Write a protein that binds this ligand. Structure first.
Ligand SMILES: Nc1ncnc2c1ncn2[C@@H]1O[C@H](CSCC[C@H](N)C(=O)O)[C@@H](O)[C@H]1O
Ligand code: NA
Lengths: 265, 265
């Protein structure tokens, strides 16, 4: 009688931790969701093969409206696992599911896995220097999300880096590219005119972290906005004030213009 | 010809990913460092047994000063792995090691693993709400550092959470407890009187993240300062104003007093 939230990691089925795999293999029932992120280097079949169990995939509605009607009932008399991409609790609302579990009288455990939130380290930007993060959401109808612009502004004023999660609509198989995020940010700049995001802004793009050959690129928006960063998922970062070694890494590893080596203290 | 930066994860030998384990097994040489952090839930012997390889431990000096003497020469004509607790390149100075490898004509790849930066999601605090992070260091001689206090002040001012790493003498295997961190912060408050950290401040303590039985506690400093959070490592978080959902999780899962549902939201 238990429920395990088990993260599957960044890119493929092997990004699960040994702990997560060993526990999943012993569970009676295994559910999963793939709407919170995209694992571009695997399939349901490969994951099932690895854990040696059939996996029931749930939709956002199954989870958000009927988790306690679909999964919890089984966890009352069996060992159940719920798999998610990356870490199950990062930039999702899954933490609240632990409350539902408690109320169902079901004990729950969390098995972590590599998350994009810490994977940002491969960009060379010091992780402690990141400030508030935000998500660039697709405009819908007449609704045009813009709060993420204010987040960048706030962090930038403090000299902090801004991590921008990009939108996803898994049911339509829509994954926002860093290019699309940049276009939206330029449009928000045209509206608010804070001088926060322009053609001259330095940005960093990380695509398919977790793969052996992820795309890591840094440069000015005017130069990267039309660049091909490969298949999704992508994340966009707007760095704040750069330390010398951060700039050095961006130039040497992410191909940034050599002129950024010249930090403006 | 290749150097693999492989993360060991959070707490024990099973926190490495399946990908990390399989790659480490194929490497000709395996190095590791435990100066950035320790893996309190395991031993070098258990990690070696799991990987089935002899592991050469490197000191901070070995890495910071002689990485190119010790690791790169071998990576020039062999497959070499460099194991680090958590997720690779999260430690501030590690990204630069990839530049060293490039300069030496050595290819490098990063194999991610769980990091405390993302694992803190188990506290129920929204990851996007975390601001700049800091480390609470022990005062020594005539040196009494207090910058971490200012980090909390600036984050809290903006409604953001502050992740506070606690000092470690990993080489002497000495950990700073959340209790000691609280005592220190109260002293800094005494000196700065900014109204940033007091007996009435709500804090969250996370101990042994990665374990199947971590300690997650939330409450006011006056009530938690002398509480036993179990064995280290401990991390301390000073949350900013809470979303009701965050508060509900802290009450239901972290045993926080119902009082936070009206005072800290
Ligand atoms: N492997 C990856 N590479 C690049 N971006 C990624 C990524 N995985 C997730 N992302 C980013 O994060 C967004 C989903 S938010 C969910 C994150 C997940 N819980 C985790 O811990 O990693 C994606 O739309 C994308 O913007
Ligand atoms: Na952060």
């Amino acid at each position: 009688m238990v429920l395990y939230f088990i993260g599957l990691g960044l890119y493929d089925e092997r990004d699960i931790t040994v702990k997560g795999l060993e526990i999943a293999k012993k569970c009676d029932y295994v559910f999963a969701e793939f709407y919170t992120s995209l694992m571009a280097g695997t399939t349901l079949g490969r994951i099932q093969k690895l854990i040696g169990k059939e996996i029931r995939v749930l939709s956002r509605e199954d989870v958000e409206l009927n988790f306690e009607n679909i999964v919890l009932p089984l966890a009352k008399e069996n060992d159940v696992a719920f798999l998610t991409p990356g870490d199950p609790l990062v930039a999702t609302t899954h933490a609240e599911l632990r409350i539902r579990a408690k109320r169902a009288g079901v004990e729950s455990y969390v098995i972590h896995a590599p998350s994009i939130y810490s994977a940002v380290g491969i960009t060379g930007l010091h992780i402690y220097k990141f400030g508030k993060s935000a998500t660039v959401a697709y405009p819908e109808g007449n609704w045009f999300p813009t709060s993420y612009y204010d987040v960048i502004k706030e962090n930038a004023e403090r000299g902090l880096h801004t991590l921008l999660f990009l939108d996803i609509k898994a049911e339509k198989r829509m994954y926002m590219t860093a290019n699309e995020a940049m276009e939206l940010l330029l449009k928000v700049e045209d509206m608010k005119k804070g001088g926060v995001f322009t053609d001259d802004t330095l940005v960093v793009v990380l695509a398919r972290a977790g793969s052996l050959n992820p795309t890591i690129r840094a440069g000015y928006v005017k130069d990267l906005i039309r660049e091909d960063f490969g298949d999704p998922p992508h994340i966009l970062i707007v760095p704040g004030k750069l330390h010398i070694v951060e700039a050095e890494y961006l130039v040497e590893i992410a191909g940034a213009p050599r002129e950024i080596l010249r930090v403006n203290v």
